Symmetry: D2
Subunit: 330 residues, 4 copies
């Protein structure tokens, strides 16, 4: 009859509370349990047979790699159950773009996986959480959502977990993608206008079942007068790969090039990303001789997205050439 | 008759060269002298009397604090002269947003200061540098441009140097501002639609003539599983202030808070900015108890922008409350 | 103590109702009275002394010129009262951009005039109306809002009534301006980043007290294979001016030029606007010889905005040169 | 070896000329022949074997239905030939979005069809036409471009001809799509990030080979105080379908509804589109009782886009329900 959708709660602002109804930016995250969030949206029963499960209760800015894994493996078990048609995960918006992309790479299933959260706490007036959840379930319950990879439903849109990013603060249209939304969801119906072109879920070469722990990967910011300090400190403390968030097209200061070459020889992967994330992408060999130095470009992925792909990829390969190929297909 | 405008060349892609006409992104920067540039745009003579001056020949990704000081002082000199009505500066786009903001804060003059660059080298077909420069001189020669603060002229727009940022890679519309452009420049004419509302140039409490050196300020990136490693390494190497490029609304991981509190007690200013730079701003006391920890909020300025203001501001005060007032007025 | 703000209700979706809480796009407009909308936001009393007045109850798509006048004159009376500090008007979003601009041109007062509405009806889950109203009052009560012209507060932003336009359907970030927002409002506080540069309110040469009725002005759309039919039919039925919503830069088909020249000679003002409204503006004499034909360009104003300015301007002048000047200053 | 690509010239600004190099917006279109164009881009020879063919020399604002048919049939001819791998068409930008969508609907071939223009004439400094054409041929020669539908290559992007629209005037980034670009083209290479999800070319139920003429379809604009004048005049002059460019979600004024009901009974199809074209879409039965009145909703297509689909669709059916299914699939 109706689809069986499971909601995995992880905390976030969607489960947070404020001092008054006028508090739409000042609140305490992860205060409400999954059962209460379901009860707050009575109409949910009209969309699917839904049951909630509290996986964790955290503010997403304080998420760890073990949390991601615990979440990834749990999702995998649910997707393996013939009694589960769709999966919705409520997650704080600060690192939601990171978790959504992670799942897109390691969940080998065509069942819909939808990640959702809200910019305003549930206690604020005109809170965006109720409709976001409703739309999340509506999409997870839809047959047309299968095989589209991980999705995020906020601001009446259906966004790809791959490249959607929290780009605007405070406002409910916080999440944007340089390549646009895949569609929209209005009054329960899903409307598609685009399809993903990058490898995901079922057609991914990675699998959360084979992963026991993630390699350490960190990010260093680049700007005027930057020195190699942050890069070396991160590498010396364990990083197996470093995401260079350079100016413009992954540009690197001449004062930092040496440390990067040295680090590369030492076994540390160097991936060039940038802090120009509204559009475009980093081109190989353009700003730096990547072939000569044996570095890797993150294509269009912003720093935090790059880190996620790098971590997953390195559980299978440590070959810079294979890494580049992966950054060009995922 | 015609206004007297001086062009201060600093390098960049606008002065760059590519291997072929088909090379629009792969090139070598700072290869052309200011004389060659001016020459390439004969029509300039119609707008005003122009003379070039090569201050330096660098790629902006490799700019240093001494280069800023050197450029800022030279600008203050030409502005004081009565034989100068407007000033145009060619600068690489990678850190143009940083130099543009710096000058907006320290040049105590109402004469037009216009910063311009090009996304494509002059050797590329359909290069954008010729028209950008022409519009730069057109704007710097216009009386209506006085008292507007530092301006940047690219993509037929008149952008404010304060908040214009390189947001899109590769494409010519690379520079955007969350609050929009101030106006446009078409066929030599300037059209205004908005006015700046933040303190700048003449009404700035800072003066390049009173600044001999700039305090060291660095930036740490925040993301899932981030540790206090980068923050401490940076402080250990001299940083007098640290820009925290947090997720969401300047959010800080619970794993890093203790290190940030210790660093503050030690005298390191802590400024919360973010990597959500398309819109909105970081609110004081929302995600963290800034009052209690004596931290500072960067308002709407992205990481590299906040670093510029922090530096300048710290040549005059080290009082966090005064620092906060400064971040709310400039 | 507190400011006295008056809320003039005109109907709209903000006062509309849906069949269920899941109905966020399908609803019946203008069903709720001003008193109920106030009672729905208890926190309002914390911002100012507020009183409501139901001016009319309509769906804004069915608004008439007499409605605008009735609204304009009413606002004028309130602004004349020493007992009124701010004015907030709830208005359907479909033609809100039209009414907000109208008021910006004819209300000779520096007191804050804020127009607001909502994309979702008050009965939908996560309805945006409550916070929008709250923010509308917060802004109207602020002293810093004076002298900024008419403002619109939705999606946590402070937009200029001049050029903000409903650009996106369904979503709460529906209103955008090619020149960006003037600021934002969060948890009661107003944050400014830009200032208007065009003439408005107190510095306008128009006055709602001198206007008894508006001249008829209509709009004709332009596209491939368009004929002069719509243009002539509108003129023959009373239009004193016609807004040409052309392709690109106010371009006109060669098959329509004649009718336009003929109409001009007959006394009908011809104003070239366009259906390219995300940015840029229409340039005089670029696509058509406006000087020779004696036509007028709408600069950056979209068709419906152009119609509003044209109507107001023609109550003072019928000189095409003065009309052009007006389109370049307002 | 190299692919065989044919360039069909139709005119436009790309083939235009300005009075001076400083003229980027003021110019005269369709002055250059296809041979002169190809010649101006020597590098083309490296991408493939190209031959030009001047089909017509017009300004796209003056295009007619016979020009569309003539262009569509010529395209179907070249596609059938085995001596043609890809097809490039230079077209004025003003109505390029219309021709691009038309071809996407009627060309039953998987060979790449790329439409390109230029915002600046070739006589302007920093003209954009040279690189745009180069990228057009680069994309039309690429095997990965097959089965993607009609494409448009400007601003280093690969846009879908279905929903790409000229949204910004003057600037080179004029063309945008609510659902984002499909990919980008840099230094001869194509990078894909999204795939089309709507029916096109090979899977289209329409075929230019079976279309001798197109039914007349016109567009009426809606705004404050609009009357049924334009709607009726248009129907009286032959319109078989009327595109209603309403405010908001295709909203219709209560003053116009009766005329629209009478026109429908008389056999005129009524299609509700809107002038809110940055995002979202018009929902069936939301603002008006479409089922009851037997009207049709344009979904996300702007007015000029909806007109193209209505025309094409009406060469096969006049059943409103089938028309609606068509507007939801293409
Ligand atoms: C609250 C606002 O969206 C987000 C929190 N910091 C979180 O991500 O838990
Ligand atoms: C070339 C593209 O603008 C940019 C530079 N690398 C520079 O900043 O010099
Ligand atoms: C409802 C949605 O915002 C808008 C109505 N049609 C109105 O403007 O009254
Ligand atoms: C010139 C700017 O692209 C455009 C044209 N008027 C045309 O469509 O021919």
């Amino acid at each position: 009859k109706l689809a069986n959708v499971v909601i995995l709660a992880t905390g976030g602002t969607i489960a947070g509370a404020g001092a008054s109804a006028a508090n739409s930016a000042t609140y305490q995250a992860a205060k409400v349990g999954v059962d209460k969030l379901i009860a707050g949206v009575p109409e949910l029963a009209d969309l699917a047979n839904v049951r909630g499960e509290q996986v964790m209760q955290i503010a997403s800015e304080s998420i760890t790699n073990d949390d991601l894994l615990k979440l990834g493996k749990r999702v995998a078990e649910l997707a393996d159950s013939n009694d589960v048609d769709g999966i919705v995960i409520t997650h704080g918006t600060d690192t939601l773009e990171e978790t959504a992309y992670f799942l897109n790479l390691v969940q080998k299933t065509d069942k819909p996986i939808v990640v959702v959260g809200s910019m305003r706490p549930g206690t604020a007036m005109s809170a965006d959480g109720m409709l976001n959840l409703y739309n999340a379930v509506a999409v997870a319950s839809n047959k047309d959502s299968r095989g589209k990879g991980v999705l995020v439903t906020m601001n009446d849109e259906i966004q790809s977990g791959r490249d959607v990013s929290k780009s605007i603060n405070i406002k409910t249209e916080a999440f944007k993608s340089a390549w646009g939304p895949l569609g929209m969801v209005v009054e329960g119906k899903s409307y598609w206008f685009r399809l993903p072109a990058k490898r995901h879920t079922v057609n991914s070469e990675f699998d959360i079942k084979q992963i026991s722990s993630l390699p350490q990967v960190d990010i260093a910011y680049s700007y005027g007068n930057v020195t190699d300090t942050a890069y070396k400190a991160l590498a010396q403390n364990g990083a197996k790969a470093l995401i260079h968030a350079g100016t413009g097209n992954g540009s690197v200061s001449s004062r930092v090039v040496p440390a990067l070459q040295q680090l590369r020889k030492n076994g540390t992967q160097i991936i060039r990303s940038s802090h120009v994330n509204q559009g475009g992408f980093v081109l190989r060999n353009a700003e730096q001789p990547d072939d000569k130095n044996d570095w890797v470009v993150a294509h269009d992925l912003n720093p935090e997205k790059a880190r996620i792909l790098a971590m997953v990829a390195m559980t299978k390969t440590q070959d810079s050439k294979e890494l580049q190929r992966i950054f060009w297909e995922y």
